[PDB]
Design a protein around this ligand. Structure first.
Ligand code: BZ3
Ligand code: BZ3
Lengths: 287, 275
């Protein structure tokens, strides 16, 4: 396959991007991978920019709405698809490679061999969606094998996902650096998300409560965990039509260890039918 | 700094990071890295894998020795020196699983069939450790015996399904003079059992030649030979396609058998061509 430097090259065939990546790597360039499901926003662009600043980088952005990480009807069909906007954004950002595989190219044998995540996948986001993270980790493993990047970039917004990807990389001895990039926010604090488009004006106004609650908690935390959680709860309680699914303060690895001084506070809430996530670093007893 | 590597000698590494760094360095110097995964206690079957790896031009051979809990140290290393193997990778359980069992590989449904009957989690263990070894060593080719044919097929599923950039090489089964497939378990057989054990290979070779008369003739011939043996408890005798799906009307297939002799479980298999 041809590679035209300094412009966007789009490859659909896994073999094509694998060949181009291999060839680039062999000439000294360092391959950076930003895996996405399209519907690109400023959060994704932050990832692209982080990747682009690595000296000698060539940036590969994958766009693939992975059916394996969705449960039956109708989340997969409802996922936003804005391909023309996505590719326009990548061109504007100076990205040289977009990898846009088909479902058939990624899953020619259906679901056969898959990744089984550790117990974290059953908690928080995985509670009512027990197969979700197996879908995520299976596709990320495949993308890593196809592209063979030196570094792979993920937002901190989906923090549990990022932790599970670090687990994947450690547990399977993958030779890639996982880079977590801090959450990009709207001016009022709202975390970037492709689901923000489903907030009507009232819901958009109310949605500020998630980030306001988290940031209140982070500052309250000088007074301890209870104070932090209660400050967040108070802000969420004050918000019209925010229905909290969970609000949890955990150790930074979200694993089988108690909170000791460095934590992550995670929230998920519904505004109408729209489920929003956010999270923040918490230091306990630290001003 | 890359760990020391002495060309033409057996270099032994226990740390995953060490063998990873050495393998990477060697492939940059124009070597082709060949991986032979084993659980030690090496026999002539393993040596055939080693010789197959060695004959690839540019080869450097990595033999891993790891008893994988999820599925003779000095003597093994001496055998490898004698074969001209340059790398042995001998990690501890703690080095392979520093965080315990966490993320694992879930095989497809083939893993529940045949050998997966008595050992329903066996292949998950095998695929998980093989994936890790492939990521640590990053070989150009990886070598497995055909004797554990279902294992080999599941490894080919792993490689295809996860888009791994490695060639899987199956090596024809090494056999004792009477046909018994090589295995560390053969020495456990008493004389009566050892004599009866020849029935597995004899049944398969009979079937392979009976196959000109069709699938049923092949299966019936194999069953007759097993039926002539005392103390051979057949767990299965199945004719499948080469990927272990259902056998087609004509074409290539594989005939697999497993049996228990006393407390010792033996496996064997053979290529079958129908008609
Ligand atoms: C870097 O900040 C962000 C924020 C939200 C995001 N959603 C998906 C990636 C991502 C990144
Ligand atoms: C290539 O022949 C063989 C025969 C039996 C085997 N057992 C484990 C590896 C192996 C290889």
């Amino acid at each position: 396959p041809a590679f035209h430097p300094g412009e966007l090259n789009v490859y659909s065939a896994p073999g094509d991007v694998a060949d181009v990546s291999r060839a680039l790597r062999l000439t000294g360039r360092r391959v950076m991978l930003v895996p996405t499901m399209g519907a690109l926003h400023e959060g994704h662009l932050a990832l692209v920019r982080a990747a682009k600043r690595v000296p000698g980088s060539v940036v590969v952005v994958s766009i693939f709405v992975n059916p394996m990480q969705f449960g039956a009807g109708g989340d997969l069909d409802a996922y936003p698809r804005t391909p023309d906007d996505d590719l326009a954004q990548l061109r504007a950002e100076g990205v040289e490679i977009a990898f846009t595989p088909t479902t058939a190219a990624m899953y020619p044998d259906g679901l056969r061999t898959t990744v089984q995540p550790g117990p974290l996948a059953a908690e928080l986001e995985g509670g009512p969606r027990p197969t979700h993270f197996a879908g995520v980790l299976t596709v990320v493993l495949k993308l890593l094998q196809i592209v063979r990047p030196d570094r792979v970039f993920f937002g901190e917004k989906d923090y549990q996902q990022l932790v599970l990807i670090r687990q994947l990389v450690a547990d399977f001895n993958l030779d890639v650096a996982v880079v977590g990039v801090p959450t990009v926010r709207e001016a009022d604090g709202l975390a970037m998300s492709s689901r923000n488009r489903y907030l009507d004006p009232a819901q958009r106004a109310a949605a500020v409560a998630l980030s306001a609650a988290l940031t209140a908690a982070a500052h309250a935390a000088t007074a301890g965990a209870q104070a932090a959680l209660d400050a967040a709860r108070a802000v969420l309680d004050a918000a019209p039509g925010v229905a909290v699914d969970y609000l949890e303060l955990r150790d930074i690895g979200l694993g089988p260890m108690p909170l000791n001084g460095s934590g992550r506070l995670l929230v998920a809430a519904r505004l109408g039918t729209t489920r929003l996530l956010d999270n923040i670093a918490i230091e306990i007893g630290t001003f």
